[PDB]
Design a protein around this ligand. Sequence first.
Ligand SMILES: NC(=O)c1ccc[n+]([C@@H]2O[C@H](COP(=O)([O-])OP(=O)(O)OC[C@H]3O[C@@H](n4cnc5c(N)ncnc54)[C@H](OP(=O)(O)O)[C@@H]3O)[C@@H](O)[C@H]2O)c1
Ligand SMILES: NC(=O)c1ccc[n+]([C@@H]2O[C@H](COP(=O)([O-])OP(=O)(O)OC[C@H]3O[C@@H](n4cnc5c(N)ncnc54)[C@H](OP(=O)(O)O)[C@@H]3O)[C@@H](O)[C@H]2O)c1
Ligand SMILES: O=C(C[C@]1(c2ccc(-c3ccc(F)cc3)cc2)[C@H]2C[C@H]3C[C@@H]1C[C@@H](C2)[C@@H]3O)N1CC(O)C1
Ligand SMILES: O=C(C[C@]1(c2ccc(-c3ccc(F)cc3)cc2)[C@H]2C[C@H]3C[C@@H]1C[C@@H](C2)[C@@H]3O)N1CC(O)C1
Lengths: 276, 259
Amino acid sequence: ASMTGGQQMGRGSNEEFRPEMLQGKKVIVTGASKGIGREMAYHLAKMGAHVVVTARSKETLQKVVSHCLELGAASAHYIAGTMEDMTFAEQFVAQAGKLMGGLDMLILNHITNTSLNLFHDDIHHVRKSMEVNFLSYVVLTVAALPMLKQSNGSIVVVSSLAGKVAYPMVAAYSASKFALDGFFSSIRKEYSVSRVNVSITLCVLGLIDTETAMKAVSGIVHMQAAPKEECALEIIKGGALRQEEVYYDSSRWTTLLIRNPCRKILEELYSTSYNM
Amino acid sequence: EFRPEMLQGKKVIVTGASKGIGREMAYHLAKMGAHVVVTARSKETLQKVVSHCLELGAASAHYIAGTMEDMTFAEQFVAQAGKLMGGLDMLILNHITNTSLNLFHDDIHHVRKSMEVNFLSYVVLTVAALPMLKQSNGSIVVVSSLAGKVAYPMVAAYSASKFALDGFFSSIRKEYSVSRVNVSITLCVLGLIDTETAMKAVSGIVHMQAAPKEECALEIIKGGALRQEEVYYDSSRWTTLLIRNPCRKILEELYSTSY
Ligand SMILES: NC(=O)c1ccc[n+]([C@@H]2O[C@H](COP(=O)([O-])OP(=O)(O)OC[C@H]3O[C@@H](n4cnc5c(N)ncnc54)[C@H](OP(=O)(O)O)[C@@H]3O)[C@@H](O)[C@H]2O)c1
Ligand SMILES: NC(=O)c1ccc[n+]([C@@H]2O[C@H](COP(=O)([O-])OP(=O)(O)OC[C@H]3O[C@@H](n4cnc5c(N)ncnc54)[C@H](OP(=O)(O)O)[C@@H]3O)[C@@H](O)[C@H]2O)c1
Ligand SMILES: O=C(C[C@]1(c2ccc(-c3ccc(F)cc3)cc2)[C@H]2C[C@H]3C[C@@H]1C[C@@H](C2)[C@@H]3O)N1CC(O)C1
Ligand SMILES: O=C(C[C@]1(c2ccc(-c3ccc(F)cc3)cc2)[C@H]2C[C@H]3C[C@@H]1C[C@@H](C2)[C@@H]3O)N1CC(O)C1
C-alpha cells in the first residue's frame, strides 16, 4: 500500500480502457436505486472502487449497497433523499465525501419522473424538470469541485439524444438536457483556461431497456432499446478516459450523424478572443 | 422574400424592448404600421419607446412595465396586452436578466435567475399567448444566441438558459406540426451585436466586428414574418457556414417514423 506507487494512465491511456483505472476510486452515483444508475453502481463494485449511491428510496438503495459489496466494491454506502431539495444535494456530497475520504468521480444520473405527453400548460413539470434534472446537477458540482480538484477527478453528466436534437412529447425534459450541455460545456472551457484538471463527460444516450423507459414508451413510441448493462459501462469508460462526450444508441445511423464537427470547429475559432 | 406590409396592422408583443435589439424591433414594427405592446422593467425608458413608436407610424403603441422574474406578471402581461390590441399575431421573446462575463464558481442564484428570466418566463409567456396565436395562426419569435448553439466560457448560466430555449421550443414546434397548430416558432441565433450592454460587457475582454442592432432587429422580424424555423445573424462569414446543423435535421426526421 505505502510501498506501492506509479500510474495506471500512460501511453495509450486516452484511448484504451482498463477496469484497473477505477481500482480504488471514490465514486458518487446519483439516481442509482434502479436503471442505468444501479447498473453503473454494479460495474464500479466489480472494478474495485468505493461507491456512495443516492435516490429517494431507502429500501431500494439498501438492496443496491448489499449487492455492491458482494461484487467486490472497496466500500458501498447510500444516502437517501430528494434532488428537489438543494440543501439535501449540497450536504449529500459533503456527507458522501466524508464516507470515502474524498472523491474521484461524480456521476450525475437522476431525473424527475417524466412521461411522454404533448406540452399544454404544465409549468410545474417545466420548473421541476429544470430544478431536478439541471439545477441539482449544478449544486452537486459546486459541492464536489474542491474534492475533485484535489484528486484531479471527473464529472460524468448523463444526458440524452433529446439533449442534442429535438423530439416531440418531451419539451420540459429536452429543455433540461439541452441546459446541461450549455452549462457543462461552458465550464469545461473555463476549466481548460483556469487549468482546473477536472474532466467533464456528457453522455448522449438513445433508448435504454430500463423498466421506466419501456413502460413510458409502451404503445406510443416503437423504437429499438439498447441494453442498460452495456450503457452503464460505456458511461464509466468515457468518464475514466476523460472523454468530453460519450454517445450510446442502438442505431448505426445515430452514431454516424450525432457528432457535430462544425460545433467543434466554431468553438476552436474563438481561442483567439480571450484576455487575462 | 419579405415585405414590410406583412406587419401592417398586426398585433405584436416585444419583450425587453426598452433598449438594444428589443427597442430596434419596436421601432421597425411601428414603421410597418403594427399595433405594439412593449415591456421591460423601466417605465421611463418604455414611455420614450412608445412615443418614438407612435412617431414612426404605429397603429397603436402601449407599454406595460414589470419584471420577468415574476411569473404572475408574465402571465397577466399577455392577457393585458391581448385586451389592449384585441388579440395577438406575433410574440417576440427577447428579454434576458443582466449578465456579465465571469468564470463560474458558486453563483447558483445567477444560475437560477438566468433559468427563470431567460427561459421559464418565455414558457409562461407562450402558454398565456397560445390561445390568441392559434386564433390568428400567429408566430412565436425566440431571441437566442450563438452561445445557445455552441459552448462559450464565462457565460455558463446564460448559455444553459439559451440551450434550454432550443430544447423546449424545437420540441413544441414538432408537437405543433403533428397537432396541426398553425403557430410558427422562430429561434434567432445571434452573434456579437453593437448594443450598449454587449459593447460594455466585452470591453477589454474580447474584440470583434460588432454587427449593427438595426439590421439585427429587422432580420429577427423578417424570419418571424416568413415563419422560418431558425434565423442566423453574425458578422463572421465562417459562422454562417458552420452554425447550421444538417445532421440534426436528418436525425430528427429518422425518429418521426417511430410514433
Ligand atoms: N432509459 C432511457 O431510455 C434513457 C435514454 C436517454 C437518457 N437516459 C438518462 O439516463 C438516466 C437514468 O435513466 P433510467 O431510465 O435509468 O432511470 P430510472 O430507472 O427511472 O431511475 C431514475 C432514478 O432516479 C431516482 N430519482 C427519481 N426522482 C428523483 C428525485 N426527486 N430525487 C432524486 N433522485 C430521483 C430514482 O429513484 P426514486 O424514484 O426512488 O427517487 C432512480 O434511482 C437519466 O438521466 C435519463 O435521462 C435514459
Ligand atoms: N447584443 C448581443 O451581442 C447579442 C448576442 C447574442 C444574443 N443576443 C440576445 O439578444 C437579446 C437582446 O440583447 P440586447 O443586447 O439588445 O440586450 P439589452 O440592451 O441588454 O436589453 C435587455 C432588455 O431586457 C430588459 N430586462 C432586463 N432584465 C429584465 C427583467 N428582469 N424583466 C424584464 N425585462 C428585463 C432590459 O431593460 P430593463 O432593465 O429596463 O427591464 C432590456 O429591455 C437577448 O436575448 C440576448 O441574449 C444579443
Ligand atoms: O431520453 C430518452 C428516454 C426517454 C424518452 C425520450 C424521448 C422519446 C421519444 C422518442 C421518439 C419520439 F419521436 C419522441 C419521443 C422516448 C423516450 C424515456 C421516457 C421518458 C423521457 C426520456 C427519459 C425517460 C425514459 C422518461 O421516462 N430518449 C429515448 C430517445 O432516444 C432519447
Ligand atoms: O450572447 C452573446 C452576447 C453576450 C456575450 C456572450 C458571450 C461572450 C463571450 C465571447 C467570447 C468568449 F470567449 C466567451 C464569451 C460575449 C458576450 C453579451 C454580454 C452578456 C452575455 C451575452 C448576452 C448579453 C450581451 C450580456 O450582456 N454573444 C456574443 C457571442 O457571439 C454570443
